[PDB]
Amino acid sequence: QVQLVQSGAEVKKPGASVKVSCKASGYTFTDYYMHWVRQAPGQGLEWMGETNPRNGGTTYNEKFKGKATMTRDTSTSTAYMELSSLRSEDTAVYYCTIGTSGYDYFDYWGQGTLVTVSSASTKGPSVFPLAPSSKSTSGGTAALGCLVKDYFPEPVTVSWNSGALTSGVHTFPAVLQSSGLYSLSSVVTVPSSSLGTQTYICNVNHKPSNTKVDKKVEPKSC
Amino acid sequence: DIVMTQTPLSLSVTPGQPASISCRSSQSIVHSDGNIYLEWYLQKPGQSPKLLIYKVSYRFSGVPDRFSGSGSGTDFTLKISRVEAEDVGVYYCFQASHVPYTFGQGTKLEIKRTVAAPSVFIFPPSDEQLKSGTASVVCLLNNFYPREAKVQWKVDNALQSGNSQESVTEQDSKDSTYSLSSTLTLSKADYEKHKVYACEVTHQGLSSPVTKSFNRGE
Numbered sequence A: 001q002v003q004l005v006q007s008g009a010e011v012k013k014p015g016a017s018v019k020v021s022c023k024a025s026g027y028t029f030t031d032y033y034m035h036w037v038r039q040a041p042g043q044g045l046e047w048m049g050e051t052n053p054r055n056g057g058t059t060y061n062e063k064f065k066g067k068a069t070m071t072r073d074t075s076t077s078t079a080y081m082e083l084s085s086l087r088s089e090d091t092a093v094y095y096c097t098i099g100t101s102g103y104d105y106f107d108y109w110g111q112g113t114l115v116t117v118s119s120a121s122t123k124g125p126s127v128f129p130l131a132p133s134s135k136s137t138s139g140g141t142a143a144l145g146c147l148v149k150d151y152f153p154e155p156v157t158v159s160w161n162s163g164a165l166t167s168g169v170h171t172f173p174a175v176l177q178s179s180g181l182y183s184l185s186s187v188v189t190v191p192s193s194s195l196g197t198q199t200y201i202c203n204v205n206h207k208p209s210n211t212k213v214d215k216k217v218e219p220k221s222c
Numbered sequence B: 001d002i003v004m005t006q007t008p009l010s011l012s013v014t015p016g017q018p019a020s021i022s023c024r025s026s027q028s029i030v031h032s033d034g035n036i037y038l039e040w041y042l043q044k045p046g047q048s049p050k051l052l053i054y055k056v057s058y059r060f061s062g063v064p065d066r067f068s069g070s071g072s073g074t075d076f077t078l079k080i081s082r083v084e085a086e087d088v089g090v091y092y093c094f095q096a097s098h099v100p101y102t103f104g105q106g107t108k109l110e111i112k113r114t115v116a117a118p119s120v121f122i123f124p125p126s127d128e129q130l131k132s133g134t135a136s137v138v139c140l141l142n143n144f145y146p147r148e149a150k151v152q153w154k155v156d157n158a159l160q161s162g163n164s165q166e167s168v169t170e171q172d173s174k175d176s177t178y179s180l181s182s183t184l185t186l187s188k189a190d191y192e193k194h195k196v197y198a199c200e201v202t203h204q205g206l207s208s209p210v211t212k213s214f215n216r217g218e
């Protein structure tokens, strides 16, 4: 029931500032310290600091002090982490986490906010169906999918039939095109016998532009 | 800061095998209260980390029986009694005894399952994309093992170069396999120059390569 609701994604120019939110639900906000954790390529996982939900003070990891400003809003039960004068090295996933048994462990985490530091404009994707046909069958099985092409920046999340289809689902890591834009694909193996009764919809979410796309993948008569 | 060093960086074990991961702290991690706040977290790609072990040896609630932890002074070990497909990901050790709290660099766990040949599927460009002036052909290699699988795009048997992108999944947490998506993208004008579009698949589990193809316009 405890949920930490995060911003998802943020795109910012270098030198700009970003305020990452973490909305607390399913518990009394003032009961637990809020933590911020960075996951960046190379540096990896790093604890940034803990914010006291009572006095509102933060105990920082010296490395992030000044650079990151960690606050706690009791009127909206939201904790915030503000990164000032963004540089390309700041591109990372930012997690908010809490511990429910004193200072023993981090049992609850947010989904993470992917902050991209870039001068380039946000670009929503194209969503093309990868229709099942005679060319995509393997002994009673039919493969189908969605090609999520030409977006910027990361991430894109994909689900099938609003999360109801997960068995045999493969969402591929994004590839970086020669244009600087990203592309990914998401596939599912389903019975070939049920192509005439089931509807398969890929639910595409380009987090940085908040573009939600529900694309029906209809069978091909080829 | 306390440096947390994990060994090995990559662990590969066969199904039915135990798994051990070492975590070395560059300094003592005894909190002022006398306890050691050493934790273990499992992270799957594009998922938040999940708590396994806390305070060196205590198994977190809801964590499977097979997981356990130990260690003394600066030496710490994460143990899996028998690896399950659901165990793949990156294991991180973490100290919360001294500020700033620090994580290990992580250990990637891989299941060395029985060789599995890929099932090959091909998708011609959709009718929708063709209206845009671009044509993408997709070749899918599904549920194979090991991850080393080669894709060769052929247009009328002429080996293609410079216009394709591919991506491999993380190891599957149900059957310990990998899947690979390869996309050949050409302008509509370049697409309409060739007839036989084929992806030739080479893999350890395939005695001879698998070629999936279609004729453009068929």
Ligand SMILES: Cn1c(CNc2ccc(C(=N)N)cc2)nc2cc(C(=O)N(CCC(=O)O)c3ccccn3)ccc21
Pocket: A030, A031, A032, A033, A050, A098, A099, A102, A103, A104, A105, A106, B037, B039, B096
């Ligand atoms: C340093 N610090 C943190 C930071 N969180 C943290 C989480 C996880 C981890 C970790 N991963 N090991 C490491 C640190 N939480 C703390 C809880 C207490 C505490 O005992 N109480 C009880 C007293 C009361 O009922 O108020 C408490 C509870 C809520 C608010 C204030 N005080 C003391 C000190 C604490």
